[PDB]
Amino acid sequence: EFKRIVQRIKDFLRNLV
């Protein structure tokens, strides 16, 4: 329940940078 919030951001900047 605390991995979906971090997994949604880690791939939010790793796909644009």
CB neighbour class for 15 (10 Å; exposed up to 12, middle 13-18, buried from 19): exposed
Q: How far from the centroid of its chain's Cα atoms is residue 3's Cα?
A: 9
Length of the chain: 17
Which technique was the structure solved with, according to the deposited record? NMR
Q: How far from the centroid of its chain's Cα atoms is residue 2's Cα?
A: 12
The DSSP string of 1-17 is --SHHHHHHHHHHTTT-
Q: Which two tokens stand for residue 10?
A: 């880690």
